[PDB]
Design a protein around this ligand. Structure first.
Ligand SMILES: Nc1ncnc2c1ncn2[C@@H]1O[C@H](CSCC[C@H](N)C(=O)O)[C@@H](O)[C@H]1O
Ligand SMILES: [Zn+2]
Lengths: 19, 178, 153
């Protein structure tokens, strides 16, 4: 994976749900 | 009583004003439906974009009850939407060419016709017909519907008086459902 | 102690308190490097916090790349995706007689999955919790406990 020390809240894009 | 943004039929993260006519988005696309929906005849309402900060957006239109509250309007088979960004129309997550975009200060109009004759959804920008967006839509009950991406602010008007009533278009205002 | 204090202490100390080594249960596991008192935070199950609705999209993607999916649901609304970004908590094995448990805590409006010690745990022990997988139609369990339920699912 890639190590992280703390949670990151995913930053959705405007187009996140689009085809 | 009067038609308002729904009390419980709403994504919890949306910030709804106490009067229940203004809503502000929060992070990823999420949705709120009106308190009343329609099954037949022709109906109208308006939404004003109060504020549209950089990298915020709206997808506005009509939704059946099963439309996913945690997704943009137009995500699934239950709704049809119009995107502020580029004026794209969306249904089942497919975005198609439709009109030019809309933004801060614009007053958008939302028409649906469900003959008891083909069903239609038509969008308006400051009173002007932007073209028929969808035709022969799924049968069902349709609610006015707002979905927002990040912290833009919109206000819905169900009638009876509209800011830009379209010329030669017959409808009842959504407020008639109240 | 206020939860954010306990949580701060956890993040500042977990790296020297636990480590990854070969496990007799399976593959690599997470192990205790210093005694841990009952009820104490052990490690966070860290990763990318996504809305629940995005899991399907991500699972199909990972599936297409042949990538093992590592998700820990927080609640009905959110999930921790540690598939691509995460920490050592990914190596915690299941046990039918575990010595840890998972709980959701809230910090400054953000939810976190934290592994807690069920009992006093001693240096050298492997750290385990109950995965609580729903029953399928099967993954053999090797936790070694007398009460082993023989499958994870
Ligand atoms: N009690 C158990 N018995 C058999 N396999 C287990 C197990 N607990 C965890 N596993 C294995 O570990 C996976 C979870 S990932 C946990 C870390 C893993 N041991 C590793 O070396 O990467 C499970 O899908 C299962 O394949
Ligand atoms: Zn077992």
């Amino acid at each position: 994976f890639k190590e992280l020390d703390e949670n990151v809240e995913y930053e959705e894009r405007e187009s996140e749900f689009d085809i | 009583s009067r038609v308002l943004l729904a009390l419980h039929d709403r994504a919890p993260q949306l910030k709804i004003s106490d009067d229940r006519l203004t809503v502000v988005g929060e992070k990823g696309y999420s949705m709120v439906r009106a308190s009343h929906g329609v099954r037949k005849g022709a109906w109208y309402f308006e939404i004003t974009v109060d504020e549209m900060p950089p990298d915020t957006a709206a997808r506005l239109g009509w939704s059946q009850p099963l439309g996913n509250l945690q997704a943009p309007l137009g995500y699934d088979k239950f709704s049809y939407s119009w995107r502020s960004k580029k004026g794209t129309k969306f249904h089942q997550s497919i975005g198609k060419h439709y009109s030019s975009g809309y933004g801060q200060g614009d007053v958008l109009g939302f028409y649906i016709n469900l003959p008891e004759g083909s069903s239609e959804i038509i969008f308006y920008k400051n009173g002007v017909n932007q073209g028929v967006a969808y035709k022969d839509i799924f049968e069902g009950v349709y609610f006015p519907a707002i979905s927002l991406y990040k912290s833009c602010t919109v206000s819905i008007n169900f009638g009876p008086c509209f800011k830009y009533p379209p010329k030669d278009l017959t409808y009842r205002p959504m407020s008639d459902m109240g | 102690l206020p939860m954010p204090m306990r949580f701060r202490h956890l993040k500042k100390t977990s790296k020297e308190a636990v480590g990854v080594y070969r496990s007799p249960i399976h593959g690599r596991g997470l192990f205790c490097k210093r005694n841990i008192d009952a009820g104490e935070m052990v490690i966070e199950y860290a990763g990318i916090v996504i809305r629940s609705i995005l899991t399907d999209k991500r699972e199909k993607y990972y599936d297409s790349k042949g990538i093992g999916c590592y998700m820990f649901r927080i609640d009905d609304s959110e999930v921790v995706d540690a598939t691509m970004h995460g920490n050592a908590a990914r190596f915690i094995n299941h046990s039918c007689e575990p010595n840890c448990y998972s709980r959701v805590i809230n910090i400054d409006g953000q939810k976190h999955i934290v592994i807690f010690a069920m009992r006093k745990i001693y240096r050298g022990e492997e750290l385990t919790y109950d995965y609580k997988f729903p029953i399928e139609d099967k993954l053999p369990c090797n936790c070694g406990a007398k009460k082993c339920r023989k499958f994870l699912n």
